Amino acid sequence: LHKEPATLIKAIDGDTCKLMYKGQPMTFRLLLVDTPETKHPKKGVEKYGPEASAFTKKMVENAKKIEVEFDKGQRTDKYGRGLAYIYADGKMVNEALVRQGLAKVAYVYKPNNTHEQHLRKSEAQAKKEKLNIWS
Ligand SMILES: Cc1cn([C@H]2C[C@H](OP(=O)(O)O)[C@@H](COP(=O)(O)O)O2)c(=O)[nH]c1=O
Ligand SMILES: [Ca+2]
């Protein structure tokens, strides 16, 4: 895969944010994970939703560097959102959330699953430590 610089525009929730990419603002959705809902009335404000939002927000706002890393399949979803692994100062936000028990590994659609095993391994650790979503 290949990392590319991006610039934080606005953090939306635990797994969605707006970034300035290649000169254009665009909204991104983290690959292979799912943080709890805080918007959509169908899901309502799910537990740990606000926690995941705060974790992500903090991590991306205090970063000196943000990088996007597309996987090997499609780069956008049906809503026009960019699909990527996002790094804040070299740390993958996707993994950071899973490791804390603030997200579950989800929407694993190949071939966009290069980091699936790494992420699951962290989810297992968060799980055995009964962290947040797993408590
Ligand atoms: C992470 C991800 C989300 N999605 C879709 C699945 C869900 O569609 P539906 O809206 O049809 O359920 C939605 C989940 O994202 P949210 O967690 O932002 O809802 O985005 C993908 O198609 N590919 C992906 O890789
Ligand atoms: Ca979410």
Structural account:
It is globular and about 40 Å long. Strand 2 and strand 3 form a beta hairpin. Helix 2 packs parallel to helix 3 (116-128). The chain starts with a strand and ends in a 7-residue tail after the last helix. It has three helices and eight strands; from the N terminus they run ββββαβββαβα. By secondary structure, it is α+β, with helices and mostly antiparallel strands. It has one domain: OB fold (Dihydrolipoamide Acetyltransferase, E2P) (Beta Barrel). Bound molecules: thymidine-3',5'-diphosphate and calcium ion.
Give the helix/strand layout:
Elements: E1 3-11, E2 16-21, E3 24-30, E4 33-34, H1 49-61, E5 66-70, E6 82-88, E7 91-92, H2 93-100, E8 104-105, H3 116-128
Parallel strand pairs: 3-6
Antiparallel strand pairs: 1-2, 1-5, 2-3, 4-8, 5-6, 6-7
Helix pairs in contact: 2-3
Bound molecules: thymidine-3',5'-diphosphate and calcium ion (CA).
CATH topology: OB fold (Dihydrolipoamide Acetyltransferase, E2P)
In the sheet with the most strands, the strands line up as: 1-2-3-6-5
Oligomeric status: monomer
CATH architectural type: Beta Barrel
**Number of E-type strands:** 8
Protein name: Nuclease A
Subcellular location: Secreted
Binding site for Ca(2+): 15, 34-35
Active site: 29, 37, 81
Tags for this entry?
3 helices; 135 residues; two-stranded antiparallel sheet; 25% helix; binds calcium ion; 8 strands; alpha+beta; binds thymidine-3',5'-diphosphate; 5-stranded mixed β-barrel; OB fold (Dihydrolipoamide Acetyltransferase, E2P)
